[PDB]
C-alpha cells in the first residue's frame, strides 16, 4: 500500500524509429492533492530518460542517486550511457537496498546511441529488468494503462502516431484512477529531435 | 645499478635493490639449501616418483617421525626440502587449501591449482616486510583424470611450474644436470624406469650406495591414485634390482 | 636521534628514559610552593609574566578541582589541562555514585593512574604518546583534616608537609624545611610561603606577580583575590 | 651485521639468528632428559635451586598437560610456563571438540606450529625454551616428543635438553629402553641425571621426577617418594666407584 | 605471531624529488624477459618469449600470455608472481564491472583499475611496488587497443612498443618496421622478428608465446599456429 | 619496525617538512601546465610530455580532466597521484550536487583535496601526493575563476599563474605581459602561445606538443572544449606571423 | 649496544637486556621482607621518603582479605598488578564464593607479565612482589620479578641491599617455622634492619608491617601499631 | 593505524617536535592584535605580491562565528584545518548551549586541539600560532594568542609571524591608553607596528576590524592607504616640531 500512497503513472511506448515517454503530473498525500506539475520524468542523457512512479521522496532520491552514478560514469568512460547500460546500473542501484527497498518501479525509454535503435523496459521495486518491444507500463492504474496499450499500441509508428497512442493511453487510463491525472507530460524523442507536451486533461 | 649495489634496507626487508633485486628471496633460497638434504622427483609415463634421503643421525630418535614425505589429499603427496618447521606450516596449510577447495567447489583439487595457491602465499610473504619468507621448497605429486602424472614445485619467491623431473636442496644443480641427461635420450619410461631413474640420480649426486633406511619414497600411479610411501621391503626389492645391474 | 629508542625502553639503570626527560622537563617550570597546617593547605605559586602586554590573571597555575580541594601546577600547563580535567571528572563521578566528597589521597590516585599510560604499539589511536611533562601539588580538606599531596609524572604520588616544585624547587625546600613546624598556623604558612617566593623568584614580588589559594575546614576552595594579596604583602 | 635484530630477517647465508640465539639461551639452562620405556615414559629434571630461601618444589620443571601428557622444560621458566598453558588449552579444545583425550602426535604438532609462528614476525620474540612431550595409553603406546625453540617436533626414545645433553645422550644411548619397564626407567634416569650434574658448577639441586604409563594406568604424575628415593640412592651408590 | 603489518610508505621521495623504489621496480621490469605488443587495423597481437633454463620444465603448464576476459588479454615483463596477484586482480575487477554493468568491461578502464592498484601498492605502508610491467590488449566497438602500464601506476596508449631487455633496440626496430593499415597477420610476423632481434640461440614454437585480440576475441595462439608463423619467417 | 620508518610526517630541525619539499621537486621536475583568466572565459595549456612516434591517440586529453559540467583541472606531477585526486575531486563533486542540487564552487572543491592533500600531510605515516593541480571553472557567485594547488595542501586564487618545468620564467612573462582587466579569451590565448613558446625551448612549438583547454559560458551554459589541432596550428602560425612583423618593425 | 633497547630481541649470549633493566629498577627500590611461620605470613618493608617533610611512601597494599603484597620498583607497575589481583580476587569471589588460592593468582600475575616481555613496543613490569597469603594450604610467600619468573620462598627479601636480609634470613630459617607470631615479626624486623645504613636505625616513621594469618585477616600496621612489634627488638649487632 | 610516537621527550627535557613547530610559525608573516576600548584590530603583513594573485583567497584573516575572528601565522595548511574545526565547534556549541561562545572558551577549544595533536601517536603538531579576537556577550573586547604547544594566554596587544620580536617591543613602548582613545588611533597603532617590520609603506599590509555586536570588517587598500597617509603626516608634523 506504499506504492499507492502518493499515486502516478508513468507509460513507456515504442515506435519505428523514436520512443515515447510519459507520466501523470499530480502530486499528492492519500486523497489530497498538494501540487499539480510534480516531476518523475528525468533526462538521463541526449536521447535517455527515466520515469519513476512510486513513493515520491523514493523517486526525487532514486532520481538524485541515479545522477550521481550516471555522473561519474561519464566522466570516467568519457561516453554518454547506452540505454541497456542505464537499466543495468538502475537494476544494481535497486538491488542494492534488497532488503530495504525503494519504492519506485522506474521505467527507461531512450535510443541506442550510435544506432538509435528504440529502447524500453521497466523494473520492480528491487530491479528485476523487464525488456518488451511494444509498451511499458507503471503506477497505480497499470490495469487501464495494459488495456489502452494492448488495444492501441501498434508496430512501426510514426512519430506522430505513436505521440497520439500514448497520449489517448495515458489519458484514459488516469481519468479511471483517483489518485492519478492533473496533467499529463509527454516526451517524444526522434533521432534528431525531443519534442515536450503537456495534454489537456481533467482536474478532478 | 651496479651487480653488488645496495641501497637503505634492502639487505633486510623485501624492497629493491638498485638493480631490482630481493635479496631476502634469495637468502630465503639458501635457507633452502641449509636443511642438508637433496629430493629428486620424476615423472613417468602413468606414474610420479618422489625420493628423498633420509636422515637420523642418532639411534635415540625414532626413524618413524623423521619424515620429508606427506600427503595432503588421498591422492596428492608432497616432500619438503629446506627448513622443517616452515616445511610442516607449508603442509599444513596446503593440506587446508586442498580440503577447502573440496568442500566450496566438489571435487579434488587439481595438483597445479595447490601449487599455484601455495605460490601465491609465498608471493604474498615475498612482497610484505612485516614477515619473512618461508625457507622451504616443496614438490607437488598427482594423478590427473586428463593429463596423467603431474610434478609441480613451487619456491619461495612466489614462482611454480610444472616438470618431467627435478630436484631440491643441495644437490640439485647436479641432479638437473643428471636429469637433463637421462630426459634428452627420452625413452618411454615404466614404473619400475621411474622409481630406477630417481633412485640412480640420487645415488650418482651423492655418489653413495643406498640402503632401504637411507631413502623414502613416495608413489602415485594411474592404476592407483592414491599416493603411497613405499616400505622398507620395496625399497629394498628396488635397490637389489638396481645393484644387480 | 631521539627515535632510536621506543617510548617504553628501560635504561641500564632501571629507569624509563621518557620519564626522566619528563622529570627534567619539570625543572624548567615556575615554583610552586604548598603548605599543610592544622588549619588548612596554603598554595602559591609564581606566574612568571615575561610581557606588560600579558594579562596575569590568563595565567591559571592554580585551579579548582572542587569545592574542598585545589591544584598547583608546574612544567607544561598545557599538559596539565587534561590531568585537571580528569580529576575534576572524577571527583564529579564519585559525587554522582556515592553522594559525598572525594579524599585528596583518591583523588590524587586517580589522576596519578594516568600517567604511565603512554606507549606506541598495542594501543589506540589516539592515547598518550610521552608521559606528562608537568608536576602537581594537591591541596585540600576531607574527612582526614587538610591535606597536601605531590604527584610527578612516574606516577608516584605521596603525602608531603611542605613542599615545593618548579625551577628553584631545591633552594625552596630547604627554606621549606627550616620554616615549617607542626604547629604553625595558616597566616604563618601563607606569610613563609610569600617570603621563599620572593626569595627565590628573579622579579620583583607583587600582587600580579604571584597566585595564592588557600582551603580550609568550612570554607571552600579561596583563591585571593588583588586587594588581600596586597594585603598580606605589606607586611614581608 | 645487523641481520641478526628480527626473526623477519634472513642472513646473507641463509639463517635466522635470533632463532639460533633462543636456542642459546635454551643451551644455558639445566639438563631435562626423558626416556620411552616399553611401557611408559619417565621425566628427569636437574632442577638446580639458587637459594636455600626457596621452598623444595618451587620452579618446577615438570608440568601437567593433560590427564596423560607430562611437559619436561628446559630455559626461560615464564616461556615454558606459557607453552605449557598453550598445550593445555590445545588439549582441552581438542577434547571439547571431538571428544576424545589428544594423540601426542597430533598436541605435539599443534604446540610446535605454535612455537614456529613466533619464528617469522619482527613483531614477537621467538620462545628461549625446548620441552620434550610424553605419554602413554592403551591404543598408541608410549610416545615421546620434543620440540625445540625453532619449532621442529620429533619423536625419540630418549632425549634431552639443556646446559648437557651430549653427555646424557652418551648415557642414554647405553640403555636398552625398549625392553625395559618404568621401574628400572627411573632409576637409570636417576643415575644419569646425577653423572650429568656438575657439582663444581652448580651448588645444589633437586631430583624431580615422574612419568606415565600402564603403571600409572595412563595418567601422567609425579613419581611416588618410596621409588624417587630408591632411584635416588641407588644414583648416589652407582656415582661411587 | 602478529598480524600487524607497517603501516608506514616504503616508498618516499628523494631530495631531488624521486621515488627511487619505483626506480629499481623499472629496473626489475628492464631485466625480464622481452615482450612485445602491436596493434594493427583489426586486431592487436601480444608477442613474448619463454624459454626454459632447462628441458626438465612442462612448457604447457603455467602461461605468461594470459586472458582477462573474452576480449581482453594480458602479457608481462618482469617477476612472474607479481603478475599471476596482477591477473588475478584484473580478472575480478572485470568481473565486478561485469556484474555491475552487464556488459563486458572497457579495455581502458580495465587498464585504469590495475594502474590504481598498481598505485595503491606504490603509496599505501608496508609494500613495495610491483617488478612487473604489463602489456594489455583488447577490442571494444570495433576498436583494437593496447595500453603498457608501468610499476608506477601510469599507464600509456601504445601503437607497437616492447618491454623487458633489449627494449630500446625493440622500440626502434618497431620504429622502423610499424605502420599503420597493417593487418593481423602482418603484425604477428613483425612480432615475432621484433622478438628474433634480441633472441638468443633458435626461437622455435615453444619458446615463445602469442596472444591475438581481435573481433572475435582474445585467445592464445596454439604452438602449431605459432610454428607455422616462425616457419613463414 | 621503527628503524625502517622514514618518519615522512615529522617536522625538520628547521621547521620544515622534508617530503613536502620533495614532492615540491617532483612538481618542478614535470612539464609545463599553464592558466590565463579573461574576461570571456579561462584557458588552460599544458605541455604534452607523452611525446613519441609510437603513442596512440589520446583519448581526451593527456594533462587536462573535466572534474564536473562546470569545471576542469590539469595536473603536474606523479600521474597516478594525479589520477587518484581527480577520481576524488569528481567523487567531491558529485557529492555536492548530490546534497544541494546545485554545482558545487570551485573554491570548495579545491578546498576539500587540499584538505585531503594535508591530511596526508599531517598524519598517517605515509608520502604525500607529488601533484600540483591547475582548476579553471565558473560558478553563479564568482564567475570565472583560476585556481593552484600544491602538494603540501596549499591554495590560492590567480588570473594567471604556471606550474611544473621553466615555471617561474613563465610566471614573470605573465607578469610582464597579462593586462588585468582587459584580457579576451584571443588575447589570453595568444599570451598562452608566446609563453609555451618562450618556456618550451628545447621543443620546437607545434600542435602536437601542446594541449590547450578553454572554458566558455554559452546560453547560461558552460562549454569545456578542447582545441583542435588545427586550431592550435593556426594560433602557432599567427604567433609566428607576429613575431615576424614585430621583428621587420624593430 | 644493538640488542638492549628492544625486549623482542636476543643478544647473542642467549639474554634479553631489556628484562635484565626492569630487574635493575626492582632493585633500585626499597628494601623489603616476607617470611612464613606455620601459622602466619608477615610481610615488613622499610618505607623511604623523598624529605624531611614528606610521607613514607606506601609498600604494602591490600589484595583480599587472605592476600597481601609488598613492592619494589616502578609504583604504577605495582598498582597495576594490584588492581589486576584484586580484580582476579572479586571474580574468584564472585563466581566460586570462596578466596583464590594464593598460588593460583601467583600463576596468574607469571601469566600476565610473561606477555608485555614478547612483544615489539612492549617493556616489562619494573616492579617486584612479595606476596604474603593464606589458604587451605597454610601461609604462603611468593616472590614476582619482571622476567615473569615467580618463586615459592620459606623467606625473602627484595630491594636496594636485600642480600644482608636474604642471609639473616639464612641463617634463622630453621627457627622461622616453629616462631610465634611476635618472635617471627622481630626476626622479619632485625632481617630489614640488617639492610639499613650504620647510622640509621628502625622507627615508627620507616617501617610498615603486614600480617595474615588463619584466624587473623590481612592487616597493615603503620605508624602507631608497629610500637608493640619495635618494642622488645634489641640493638644492632654490628 | 599509524601509531608512532612522533612527539617525545629529549635528554634535556625539551619536545623537538613542539619547538620545531614554533620554528615554523617563525616563518610566517607577521600578524599584529591590538585590543581596544569598544574595537579590535587584527593585522597580517603579506610576504609577497605577484600582482597575478587573487587577494580573496589568501586572506589570513578569518571570522570564526559573529563575534569572534582570528589571525594566524605559520602553515596556512594547517590554519585552515584549525580554523574550521573551530568553525564547527562554534556552531555546535551555539547549537548545545544556546549562545554564541566566548572568546575565552573558543581560545580554550583550539589549545586543547593543538595539545591533542602534540600529545597523541602517529602525527606532528600543528605549525600555527593564533591570534583570536572579538567581544564578549556583555561587550568587552577579547584579545588571545595561542601556540603550537597549546598554552594561550590573553592579551592587550601582540604579535605573531616573523620580527615578532620587534613588533612586540614596539607594542610595548607604544600602547598606552591615550593610544587607544578612538578607533582611528587603534588602527594607526597596528598599522604603524606592521610598518617597521613590512615595507613599501603599506602596500603588503591587511588590516581586519571588529566593532561591538557588528559583522567582521575588511578594509580596502583605499582605506589602508589614507591610514598610512595620516600616520606620515602625524610623523612629519612631530619631526618639524620638536626638531
Not at chain 8, 609603506?201 to 578594509?219: H, T, Y
Amino acid at each position: 500500500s506504499i506504492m499507492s500512497y502518493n499515486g502516478g503513472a508513468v507509460m513507456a511506448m515504442k515506435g519505428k524509429n523514436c520512443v515515447a515517454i510519459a507520466a501523470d503530473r499530480r502530486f499528492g498525500i492519500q486523497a489530497q492533492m498538494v501540487t499539480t506539475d510534480f516531476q518523475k520524468i528525468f533526462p538521463m542523457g541526449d536521447r535517455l530518460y527515466i520515469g519513476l512512479a512510486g513513493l515520491a521522496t523514493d523517486v526525487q532520491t532514486v532520481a538524485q542517486r541515479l545522477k550521481f552514478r550516471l555522473n561519474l560514469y561519464e566522466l570516467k568512460e568519457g561516453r554518454q550511457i547506452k540505454p541497456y547500460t542505464l537499466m543495468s546500473m538502475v537494476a544494481n542501484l535497486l538491488y542494492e537496498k534488497r532488503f530495504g527497498p525503494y519504492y519506485t518501479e522506474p521505467v527507461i525509454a531512450g535510443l541506442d546511441p550510435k544506432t538509435f535503435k528504440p529502447f524500453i523496459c521497466s523494473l520492480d521495486l528491487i530491479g528485476c529488468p523487464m525488456v518488451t518491444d511494444d509498451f511499458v507500463v507503471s503506477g497505480t492504474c497499470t490495469e487501464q494503462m495494459y488495456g489502452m496499450c494492448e488495444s492501441l499500441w501498434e508496430p512501426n509508428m510514426d512519430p506522430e502516431h505513436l505521440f497520439e497512442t500514448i497520449s489517448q493511453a495515458m489519458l484514459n487510463a488516469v481519468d479511471r484512477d483517483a489518485v492519478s491525472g492533473m496533467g499529463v507530460i509527454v516526451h517524444i524523442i526522434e533521432k534528431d529531435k525531443i519534442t515536450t507536451r503537456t495534454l489537456k486533461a481533467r482536474m478532478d | 645499478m651496479s651487480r653488488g649495489s645496495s641501497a637503505g634496507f634492502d639487505r633486510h626487508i623485501t624492497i629493491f635493490s638498485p638493480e631490482g633485486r630481493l635479496y631476502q628471496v634469495e637468502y630465503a633460497f639458501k635457507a633452502i639449501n641449509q636443511g642438508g638434504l637433496t629430493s629428486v622427483a620424476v615423472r613417468g609415463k602413468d606414474c610420479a616418483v618422489i625420493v628423498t634421503q633420509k636422515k637420523v643421525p642418532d639411534k635415540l630418535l625414532d626413524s618413524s617421525t623423521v619424515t620429508h614425505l606427506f600427503k595432503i589429499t588421498e591422492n596428492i603427496g608432497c616432500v619438503m626440502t629446506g627448513m622443517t618447521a616452515d616445511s610442516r606450516s607449508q603442509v599444513q596449510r596446503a593440506r587446508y587449501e586442498a580440503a577447502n577447495w573440496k568442500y566450496k567447489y566438489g571435487y579434488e583439487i587439481p595438483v597445479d591449482m595447490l601449487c599455484k595457491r601455495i605460490a601465491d602465499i609465498s608471493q604474498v610473504y615475498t612482497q610484505n616486510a612485516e614477515m619473512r619468507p618461508l625457507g622451504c621448497c616443496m614438490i607437488l605429486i598427482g594423478i590427473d583424470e586428463e593429463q596423467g602424472p603431474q610434478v609441480y614445485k613451487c619456491d619461495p619467491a612466489g614462482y611454480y611450474c610444472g616438470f618431467k623431473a627435478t630436484a631440491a636442496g643441495v644437490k640439485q644443480t647436479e641432479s638437473t644436470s643428471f636429469l637433463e641427461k637421462k630426459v634428452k635420450k627420452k625413452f618411454d619410461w615404466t614404473f619400475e624406469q621411474t622409481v630406477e631413474t630417481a633412485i640412480t640420480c640420487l645415488s650418482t649426486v651423492l655418489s653413495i650406495d643406498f640402503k632401504p633406511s637411507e631413502i623414502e619414497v613416495g608413489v602415485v600411479t594411474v592404476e592407483n591414485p592414491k599416493f603411497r610411501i613405499l616400505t622398507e621391503a620395496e625399497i629394498d626389492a628396488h635397490l637389489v634390482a638396481l645393484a644387480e645391474r | 636521534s631521539e627515535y632510536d629508542r621506543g617510548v617504553n625502553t628501560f635504561s641500564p639503570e632501571g629507569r624509563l628514559f621518557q620519564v626522566e626527560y619528563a622529570i627534567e622537563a619539570i625543572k624548567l617550570g615556575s615554583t610552586a610552593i604548598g603548605i599543610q597546617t592544622s588549619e588548612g593547605v596554603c598554595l602559591a605559586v609564581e606566574k612568571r609574566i615575561t610581557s606588560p602586554l600579558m594579562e596575569p590573571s590568563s595565567i591559571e597555575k592554580i585551579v579548582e578541582i572542587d569545592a574542598h580541594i585545589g591544584c598547583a601546577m608546574s612544567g607544561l600547563i598545557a599538559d596539565a589541562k587534561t590531568l585537571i580535567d580528569k580529576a575534576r571528572v572524577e571527583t564529579q563521578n564519585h559525587w554522582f555514585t556515592y553522594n559525598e566528597t572525594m579524599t585528596v589521597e583518591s583523588v590524587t590516585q586517580a589522576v596519578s593512574n594516568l600517567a604511565l599510560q603512554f606507549g606506541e604499539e598495542d594501543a589506540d589511536p589516539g592515547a598518550m604518546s610521552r608521559p606528562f611533562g608537568v608536576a602537581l601539588l594537591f591541596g585540600g580538606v576531607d574527612e582526614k583534616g587538610p591535606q597536601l599531596f605531590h604527584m610527578d609524572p612516574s606516577g608516584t604520588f605521596v603525602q608531603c608537609d611542605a613542599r615545593a616544585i618548579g625551577s628553584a624547587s631545591e633552594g625552596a625546600q630547604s627554606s621549606l624545611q627550616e620554616v615549617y613546624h607542626k604547629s604553625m598556623t595558616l597566616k604563618e604558612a601563607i606569610k613563609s610561603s610569600l617570603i621563599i617566593l620572593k626569595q627565590v623568584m628573579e622579579e620583583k614580588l607583587n600582587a600580579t606577580n604571584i597566585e595564592l589559594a588557600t582551603v580550609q575546614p568550612g570554607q571552600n576552595f579561596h583563591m585571593f583575590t588583588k586587594e588581600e594579596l596586597e594585603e598580606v604583602i605589606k607586611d614581608i | 651485521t645487523g641481520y641478526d635484530l628480527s626473526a623477519s630477517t634472513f642472513s646473507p647465508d641463509g639463517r635466522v639468528f635470533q632463532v639460533e640465539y633462543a636456542m642459546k639461551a635454551v643451551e644455558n639452562s639445566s639438563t631435562a632428559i626423558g626416556i620411552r620405556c616399553k611401557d611408559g615414559v619417565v621425566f628427569g629434571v636437574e632442577k638446580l635451586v639458587l637459594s636455600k630461601l626457596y621452598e623444595e618444589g618451587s620452579n618446577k620443571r615438570l608440568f601437567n598437560v593433560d590427564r596423560h601428557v607430562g611437559m619436561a622444560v628446559a630455559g626461560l621458566l615464564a616461556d615454558a610456563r606459557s607453552l605449557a598453558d598453550i598445550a593445555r588449552e590445545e588439549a582441552s579444545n581438542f577434547r571439547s571438540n571431538f571428544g576424545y583425550n589428544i594423540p601426542l602426535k597430533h598436541l605435539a604438532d599443534r604446540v610446535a606450529m605454535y612455537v614456529h609462528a613466533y619464528t617469522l614476525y619482527s613483531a614477537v620474540r621467538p620462545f628461549g625454551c625446548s620441552f620434550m612431550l610424553g605419554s602413554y595409553s592403551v591404543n598408541d603406546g608410549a610416545q615421546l616428543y620434543m620440540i625445540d625453540p625453532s619449532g621442529v617436533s620429533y619423536g625419540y626414545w630418549g632425549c634431552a635438553i639443556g646446559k648437557a645433553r651430549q653427555a646424557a645422550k652418551t648415557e642414554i644411548e647405553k640403555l636398552q629402553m625398549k625392553e625395559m619397564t618404568c621401574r628400572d626407567v627411573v632409576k637409570e634416569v636417576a643415575k644419569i641425571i646425577y653423572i650429568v650434574h656438575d657439582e663444581v658448577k652448580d651448588k645444589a639441586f633437586e631430583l624431580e621426577l615422574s612419568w606415565v604409563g600402564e603403571i600409572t594406568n595412563g595418567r601422567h604424575e609425579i613419581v611416588p617418594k618410596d621409588v624417587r628415593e630408591e632411584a635416588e640412592k641407588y644414583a648416589k651408590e652407582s656415582l661411587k666407584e | 605471531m602478529a598480524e600487524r603489518g607497517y603501516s608506514f610508505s616504503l616508498t618516499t621521495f628523494s631530495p631531488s624529488g624521486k621515488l627511487v623504489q619505483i626506480e629499481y621496480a623499472l629496473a626489475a621490469v628492464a631485466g625480464g624477459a622481452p615482450s612485445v605488443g602491436i596493434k594493427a587495423a583489426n586486431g592487436v597481437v601480444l608477442a613474448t618469449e619463454k624459454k626454459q633454463k632447462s628441458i626438465l620444465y612442462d612448457e604447457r603448464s603455467v602461461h605468461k600470455v594470459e586472458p582477462i576476459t573474452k576480449h581482453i588479454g594480458l602479457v608481462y615483463s618482469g617477476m612472474g608472481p607479481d603478475y599471476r596477484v596482477l591477473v588475478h586482480r584484473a580478472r575480478k575487477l572485470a568481473q565486478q564491472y561485469y556484474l555491475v554493468y552487464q556488459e563486458p568491461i572497457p579495455t581502458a578502464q580495465l587498464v585504469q583499475r590495475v594502474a590504481s592498484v598498481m598505485q595503491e601498492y606504490t603509496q599505501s605502508g608496508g609494500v613495495r611496488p610491483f617488478g612487473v610491467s604489463l602489456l594489455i590488449c583488447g577490442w571494444n566497438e570495433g576498436r583494437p587497443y593496447l595500453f603498457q602500464s608501468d610499476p608506477s601506476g601510469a599507464y600509456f596508449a601504445w601503437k607497437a612498443t616492447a618491454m623487458g631487455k633489449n627494449y630500446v633496440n625493440g622500440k626502434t626496430f618497431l620504429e622502423k618496421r610499424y605502420n599503420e593499415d597493417l593487418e593481423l597477420e602482418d603484425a604477428i610476423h613483425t612480432a615475432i622478428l621484433t622478438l628474433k632481434e634480441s633472441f638468443e640461440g633458435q626461437m622455435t614454437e615453444d619458446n615463445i608465446e602469442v596472444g591475438i585480440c581481435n573481433e572475435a576475441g582474445f585467445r592464445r595462439l596454439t604452438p602449431t599456429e605459432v610454428k607455422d608463423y616462425l616457419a613463414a619467417i | 619496525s621503527r628503524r625502517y620508518d622514514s618518519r615522512t610526517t615529522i617536522f625538520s630541525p628547521e621547521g620544515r617538512l622534508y617530503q613536502v619539499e620533495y614532492a615540491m621537486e617532483a612538481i618542478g621536475h614535470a612539464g609545463t601546465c599553464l592558466g590565463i583568466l579573461a574576461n570571456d572565459g579561462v584557458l588552460l595549456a599544458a605541455e604534452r610530455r607523452n611525446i613519441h612516434k609510437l603513442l596512440d591517440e589520446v583519448f581526451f586529453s593527456e594533462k587536462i580532466y573535466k572534474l564536473n559540467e562546470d569545471m576542469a583541472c590539469s595536473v603536474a606531477g606523479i600521474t597516478s597521484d594525479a589520477n587518484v585526486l581527480t577520481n576524488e575531486l569528481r567523487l567531491i563533486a558529485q557529492r555536492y550536487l548530490l546534497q544541494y542540487q546545485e554545482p558545487i564552487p570551485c573554491e570548495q572543491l579545491v578546498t576539500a583535496l587540499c584538505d585531503i592533500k594535508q591530511a596526508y600531510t599531517q598524519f598517517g605515516g605515509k608520502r604525500p601526493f607529488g601533484v600540483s593541480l591547475l582548476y579553471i571553472g565558473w560558478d553563479k557567485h564568482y564567475g570565472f575563476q583560476l585556481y593552484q594547488s600544491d602538494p603540501s595542501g596549499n591554495y590560492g586564487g590567480w588570473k594567471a599563474t604556471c606550474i611544473g618545468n621553466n615555471s617561474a620564467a613563465a610566471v614573470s612573462m605573465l607578469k610582464q605581459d597579462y593586462k588585468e582587466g582587459e584580457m579576451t579569451l584571443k588575447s589570453a590565448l595568444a599570451l598562452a602561445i608566446k609563453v609555451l613558446n618562450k618556456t618550451m625551448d628545447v621543443s620546437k612549438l607545434s600542435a602536437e606538443k601542446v594541449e590547450i583547454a578553454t572554458l566558455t559560458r554559452e546560453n547560461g551554459k558552460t562549454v569545456i572544449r578542447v582545441l583542435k589541432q588545427k586550431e592550435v596550428e593556426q594560433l602557432i602560425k599567427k604567433h609566428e606571423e607576429e613575431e615576424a612583423k614585430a621583428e621587420r618593425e624593430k | 649496544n644493538q640488542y638492549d633497547n628492544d625486549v623482542t630481541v636476543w643478544s647473542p649470549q642467549g639474554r634479553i637486556h631489556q628484562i635484565e633493566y626492569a630487574m635493575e629498577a626492582v632493585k633500585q627500590g626499597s628494601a623489603t621482607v616476607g617470611l612464613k611461620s606455620k601459622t602466619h605470613a608477615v610481610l615488613v618493608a622499610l618505607k623511604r621518603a623523598q624529605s624531611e617533610l614528606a610521607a613514607h611512601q606506601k609498600k604494602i597494599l591490600h589484595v583480599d582479605n587472605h592476600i597481601g603484597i609488598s613492592i619494589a620498583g616502578l609504583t604504577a607497575d605495582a598498582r597495576l598488578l594490584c588492581n589486576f589481583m584484586r580484580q582476579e580476587c572479586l571474580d574468584s569471589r564472585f563466581v566460586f564464593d570462596r578466596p583464590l588460592p594464593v598460588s593460583r593468582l601467583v600463576s596468574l600475575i607469571g601469566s600476565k607479565t610473561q606477555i608485555p616481555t614478547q612483544r615489539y613496543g612492549r617493556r616489562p613490569y619494573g616492579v617486584g612482589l612479595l606476596i604474603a597469603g593464606y589458604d587451605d594450604m597454610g601461609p604462603h610467600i611468593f616472590q614476582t620479578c619482571p622476567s615473569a619468573n615467580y618463586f615459592d620462598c620459606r623467606a625473602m627479601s627484595i630491594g636496594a641491599r636485600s642480600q644482608s636480609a636474604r642471609t639473616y634470613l639464612e641463617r634463622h630459617m630453621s627457627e622461622f617455622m616453629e616462631c610465634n607470631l611476635n618472635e617471627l615479626v622481630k626476626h622479619g624486623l632485625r632481617a630489614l634492619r640488617e639492610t639499613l645504613p650504620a647510622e640509621q636505625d628502625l622507627t615508627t616513621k620507616n617501617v610498615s608491617i603486614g600480617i595474615v594469618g588463619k584466624d587473623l585477616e590481612f592487616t597493615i600496621y603503620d605508624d602507631d601499631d608497629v610500637s608493640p612489634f619495635l618494642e622488645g627488638l634489641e640493638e644492632r649487632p654490628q | 593505524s599509524y601509531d608512532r610516537a612522533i612527539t617525545v621527550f629529549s635528554p634535556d627535557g625539551h619536545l623537538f617536535q613542539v619547538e620545531y613547530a614554533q620554528e615554523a610559525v617563525k616563518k610566517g608573516s607577521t600578524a599584529v592584535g591590538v585590543r581596544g576600548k569598544d574595537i579590535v584590530v587584527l593585522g597580517v603583513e603579506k610576504k609577497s605580491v605577484a600582482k597575478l594573485q587573487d587577494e580573496r583567497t589568501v586572506r589570513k584573516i578569518c571570522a570564526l562565528d559573529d563575534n569572534v575572528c582570528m589571525a594566524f601565522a605559520g602553515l596556512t595548511a594547517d590554519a585552515r584545518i584549525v580554523i574550521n574545526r573551530a568553525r564547527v565547534e562554534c556552531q555546535s556549541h551555539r547549537l548545545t548551549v544556546e549562545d554564541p561562545v566566548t572568546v575565552e572558551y573558543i581560545t580554550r577549544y583550539i589549545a586543547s586541539l593543538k595539545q591533542r595533536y602534540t600529545q597523541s601517536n602517529g602525527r606532528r603538531p600543528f605549525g600555527i600560532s593564533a591570534l583570536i579576537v572579538g567581544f564578549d556577550f556583555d561587550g568587552t573586547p577579547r584579545l588571545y594568542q595561542t601556540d603550537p604547544s597549546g598554552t594561550y594566554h590573553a592579551w592587550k596587544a601582540n604579535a605573531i609571524g616573523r620580527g615578532a620580536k620587534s613588533v612586540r617591543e614596539f607594542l610595548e613602548k607604544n600602547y598606552t591608553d591615550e593610544a587607544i582613545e578612538t578607533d582611528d588611533l587603534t588602527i594607526k597603532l597596528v598599522i604603524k607596528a606592521l610598518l617597521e617590520v613590512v615595507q613599501s609603506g603599506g602596500k603588503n599590509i591587511e588590516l581586519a576590524v571588529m566593532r561591538r555586536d557588528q559583522p567582521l570588517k575588511i578594509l580596502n587598500p583605499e582605506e589602508i592607504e589614507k591610514y598610512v597617509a595620516e600616520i606620515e603626516k602625524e610623523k612629519e608634523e612631530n619631526e618639524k616640531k620638536k626638531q
